[PDB]
C-alpha cells in the first residue's frame, strides 16, 4: 500500500524531537546534539535501547536531570503514534467486504458488456 507515506510521519517526529534536542543540548553536548544530523543520530541510538543508548543517556541526565522526560517522551510519542496508526489500519482494512462485492460486480457486468 502507501506504507511509505506512513514513514513521512515518523521522520516528522524524528525531526521535531531532533530540533528539540538541538535547542536543549547543543551548547552542552555538541557531539550528540550540536547539529540536526547529530540530534537525529543520537535519537536513533537512544531508540535502539542498547548499550550506547544508556551511555548517551547518563551524561545528558547528569547534566540536565529533566532530560529524561525528553528521551522518554520521544520513545512514547513515537511508539504511540505507530500503535495508534497500526490500530487504525486494521479498522480501515476490515472495510474490504464491500471490495469483494466490487469485484463480483465487475464480473457480472463485464459479461453484460
Amino acid at each position: 500500500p502507501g506504507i511509505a507515506w506512513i514513514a513521512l510521519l515518523l521522520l516528522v517526529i524524528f525531526y521535531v524531537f531532533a530540533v528539540m534536542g538541538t535547542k536543549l543540548f547543543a551548547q552542552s553536548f555538541p557531539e550528540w546534539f550540536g547539529t540536526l544530523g547529530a540530534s537525529m543520530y543520537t535519537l536513533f541510538q537512544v531508540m535502539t535501547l542498547e548499550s550506547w543508548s544508556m551511555g548517551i543517556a547518563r551524561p545528558v541526565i547528569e547534566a540536565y536531570p529533566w532530560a529524561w522526560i525528553y528521551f522518554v517522551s520521544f520513545i512514547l510519542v513515537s511508539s504511540f503514534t505507530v500503535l495508534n496508526l497500526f490500530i487504525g489500519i486494521i479498522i480501515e482494512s476490515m472495510q474490504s467486504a464491500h471490495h469483494a462485492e466490487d469485484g463480483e460486480r465487475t464480473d457480472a457486468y463485464r459479461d453484460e458488456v
Partner: nanobody, 123 residues
Framework: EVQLVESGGGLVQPGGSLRLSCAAS????????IHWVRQAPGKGLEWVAS????????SYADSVKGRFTISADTSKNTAYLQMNSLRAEDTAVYYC????????????????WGQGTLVTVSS
C-alpha cells in the same frame, strides 16, 4: 564461559597494517558495546576505540583517529580493529573489553576484559 577470544596481533613493519579480531562467546553480542584499549610496555591503560555491536556507532580516540577503524559483524559475532600506518608508538598490548548492560552501560564499566594480544611494530 562469557568470554572474548581475541587474536590477529604480532609483528608488523612500520607504515604497515594489521587486523585484530575479538570473537565474543556466551552472551548477547548485539546488545553490548565492544572496546579496544591499549597498554604500551611500561605505562598505564589507554583507550583506543569503542563501538556498539548492534547500533554500529563508533567512537575513536584523538590519538588514533582516522588511522584505526573499529567494526563489528553480528553474524560473525565478532568485533574488529583494523590498524593502518602503524608506528613505534603503536607497539603495545591491546585488550578487548565489553559493556553488556542496562547497568554497566549507564556507567561505562567496562565489565569484562579480553586477555590481551601483543602488537610489536619493528623492521
Amino acid at each position: 564461559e562469557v568470554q572474548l577470544v581475541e587474536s590477529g596481533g604480532g609483528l608488523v613493519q612500520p607504515g604497515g597494517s594489521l587486523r585484530l579480531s575479538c570473537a565474543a562467546s556466551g552472551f548477547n553480542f548485539s546488545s553490548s558495546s565492544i572496546h579496544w584499549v591499549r597498554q604500551a610496555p611500561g605505562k598505564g591503560l589507554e583507550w583506543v576505540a569503542s563501538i556498539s555491536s548492534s547500533s554500529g556507532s563508533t567512537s575513536y580516540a584523538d590519538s588514533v583517529k582516522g588511522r584505526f577503524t573499529i567494526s563489528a559483524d553480528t553474524s560473525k559475532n565478532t568485533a574488529y580493529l583494523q590498524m593502518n600506518s602503524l608506528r613505534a608508538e603503536d607497539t603495545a598490548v591491546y585488550y578487548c573489553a565489553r559493556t553488556y548492560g542496562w547497568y554497566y552501560s549507564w556507567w561505562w564499566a567496562f565489565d569484562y576484559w579480553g586477555q590481551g594480544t601483543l602488537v610489536t611494530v619493528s623492521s
